[PDB]
Design a protein around this ligand. Structure first.
Ligand SMILES: [Cl-]
Ligand SMILES: [Cl-]
Ligand SMILES: [Cl-]
Ligand SMILES: [Cl-]
Ligand SMILES: [Cl-]
Ligand SMILES: [Cl-]
Ligand SMILES: [Co+3]
Ligand SMILES: [Co+3]
Lengths: 227, 202, 227, 202
């Protein structure tokens, strides 16, 4: 989707706010910590999301005005709420009513529950991860060194094909193997893995600019065609 | 709110806070989450992980030529052997800075960053200014970090558009003669492993 | 400039807020009326802006967060303030101090002045307009029916070449004549007129979409090349 | 405000109001503007101009075939003859709706609209949703206005990227037999002269 999140190549966002890393605080509010716990806790059990594809599309679907103002972990709260309602784990009305309760009475007490088995399950996700590498019977369409042209496609659902890289000539840098295909998996339509490639693009091709700059981007096979 | 213009009105951050507590409360009540599951995650990402892991890898590469060679030829195998593996660090590639090649890493589409190796991303890494600009004007962006590269140095920007992740291996600076691996690790900054800084002489 | 204002082809802005025209109120606050008076009153005297090129770039330079939240006539206030300070008609410090006065004391009285001669001058602008049509000695590079390719250029200053139309094949629909060139005139670098063309673009070329849709866009000669 | 994030904080609309009064005050004090100059502009755009001018042109075109022919062959000359000329209406073109061609006008880059002929643009015409979407999915946009065109009708979207302006000439509907020019003008909606609506039978 050609959304507010796809910012590569945009102007007007201003200077980068430099901060010494030692001063670059991770969390300034407890709800931000909670957001991390909710995301990993849910994902570890496949609740609302099995991996990060479903996670990302929920953020991309945010109202643009919210995306730019929520702060980072606000994105995470948005996608947890979106996905849990979308999959039927939570009811939207019940969630809205409970949200109102905490709005009006922020000091409302949180229920306590110890579940050591769930802790171990969450640990498994944290340490074992969720590698999207798969195998398919087909061979790669493209080879290292091949010049390709990326497609001019405009998926209305999730994609990992940034707008700035569309309809561009590039050179295959590596064939990684087949990876779970985000454009399908984000919408729960199957892993449907495709070959994933790293592709190098020159500044002159991307922007018509004159410096010794390049961008390496990972692209799924269906994002590209031969020349 | 004028119903022609609901999109002018952002949710206040108090809404996101309340929403987080509502999700927490409902999920615990329904048996999906527990207090200790949530806390386990927070402990891991706020305290257990960090850029010191990447710093150890960099210092080892600087001090052990055989290790560096192995790391660059098959970083995924090598990093997993060291235990720097997990969620969002299943496939980590190391890209080497050299005298005429400078690497910078970004997630233009969101914030992707190899947590098991580097910890949590910088504040600015997740925000639109860096994400939008670094792929198009990396020299201008790097100048805002105090890195003013000559026109003759080539810049390679790595956009983390898949689950593959990238760590920059910065060059060992001058003035480090006689330093131990441990002491060298202390010099390796988070920012140098993203590519927005070189390492200063001590 | 590739700014927040250049929205053609963007997704995520949502449904259009339909309103019956009879209910579509022009102004709901007096400062919005004032904004109109300031723009036309200044432009009629060449204060901060001689025509609309200088006017538009001041809006385009707004912080994106302000552009999306100010409301329409907030754009107009922004560009009047920008241009009057930029040309030295107003001092930024004096303007900021006076803004603070009205923030803290909104009922502060506005100075009154009748100037019937200025009223007549403003009327002249309103009725005579500011046609940008000029003549140049050169002949048009392109002809009606010619297939052209628009350039892949990324001016950092003002331009009327929307991003969605860049690097696209189109067909010349009309040669209007030479018009004041916005990319220069907005920055007070001279009228430097160039031939202006209407160009038709097909949906398949713009978007890769399949309906019987087209877009007609007016483009200056330097935005295009022959094929 | 965290100085890393000043761009998250919009100016309140109270700032724009205060800024407007500050500009007004300073410009009057310095002799650049007057109370009556400002009021003259407001009177013109809020009251003197309006879509009734375009409606008169449409009704005349429907009732006088010679006029319509003249209007379509050289609208600038014809409109100026009628007095519908001025700031932001120096060069106005009329585009004719036909059974298989539907015209829709936009200013994707801002809000450009022929004030001397149509008055001030609709609220929605100046806002991002219409501007972004109408050039790419005009059928979806028109459906939100209640206009559901067949796939066989071609849509031409006119983006007002120069100072040239465009007015749509909508078709006369059924059920208007025996109506006078005056009565027909009353049927011509603002929205029909932008292309987001056809005219309903009376
Ligand atoms: Cl929004
Ligand atoms: Cl909304
Ligand atoms: Cl380095
Ligand atoms: Cl902003
Ligand atoms: Cl700012
Ligand atoms: Cl019609
Ligand atoms: Co990311
Ligand atoms: Co406009």
């Amino acid at each position: 989707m050609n959304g507010i999140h796809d910012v590569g190549g945009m102007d007007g966002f201003g200077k980068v706010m430099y901060v010494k890393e030692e001063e670059d605080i991770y969390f300034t509010h407890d709800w931000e910590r909670l957001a991390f716990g909710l995301v990993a806790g849910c994902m570890a059990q496949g609740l609302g999301m099995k991996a990060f594809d479903e996670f990302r599309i929920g953020i991309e679907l945010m109202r643009p005005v919210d995306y730019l103002t929520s702060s980072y972990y606000g994105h995470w709260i948005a996608t947890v709420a979106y996905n849990l309602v979308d999959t039927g784990v939570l009811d939207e009305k019940e969630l809205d009513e409970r949200t109102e309760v905490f709005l009006k009475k922020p000091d409302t007490k949180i229920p306590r529950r110890e579940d050591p088995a769930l802790v171990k399950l969450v640990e498994k996700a944290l340490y074992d991860g969720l590698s999207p590498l798969r195998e398919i019977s087909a061979s790669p369409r493209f080879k290292v060194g091949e010049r390709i042209k990326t497609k001019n496609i405009h998926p209305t659902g999730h994609t990992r094909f940034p707008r700035y890289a569309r309809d561009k000539y590039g050179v295959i840098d590596e064939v990684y193997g087949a990876h779970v295909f985000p454009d399908d998996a984000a919408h729960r339509k199957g892993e449907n893995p495709q070959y994933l490639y790293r592709v190098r693009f020159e500044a002159e091709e991307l922007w018509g600019y004159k410096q010794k700059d390049s961008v390496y981007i990972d692209l799924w096979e269906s994002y590209m065609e031969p020349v | 709110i004028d119903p022609r213009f609901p999109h002018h009105h952002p949710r206040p951050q108090s809404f996101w806070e309340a929403r987080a507590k509502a999700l927490e409360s409902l999920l615990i009540e329904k048996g999906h989450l527990s207090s200790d599951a949530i806390e386990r995650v927070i402990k891991h990402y706020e305290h257990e992980l960090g850029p010191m892991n990447g710093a150890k890898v960099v210092a080892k590469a600087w001090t052990d030529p055989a290790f560096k060679q192995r790391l660059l030829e098959d970083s995924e195998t090598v990093l997993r052997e060291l235990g720097y593996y997990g969620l969002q660090g299943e496939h980590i590639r190391v890209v080497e800075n050299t005298d005429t090649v400078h690497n910078v890493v970004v997630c233009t589409l969101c914030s992707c960053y190899p947590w098991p190796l580097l910890g949590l991303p910088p504040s600015w890494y997740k925000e639109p200014a860096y994400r939008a600009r670094v792929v198009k004007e990396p020299r201008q962006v790097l100048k805002e970090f105090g890195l003013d590269l000559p026109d003759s140095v080539e810049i390679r920007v790595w956009d983390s558009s898949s689950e593959i992740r990238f760590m920059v291996l910065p060059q060992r600076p001058e003035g480090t003669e006689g330093m131990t691996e441990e002491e060298l690790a202390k010099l390796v900054t988070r920012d140098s492993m993203i590519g927005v800084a070189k390492i200063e002489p001590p």
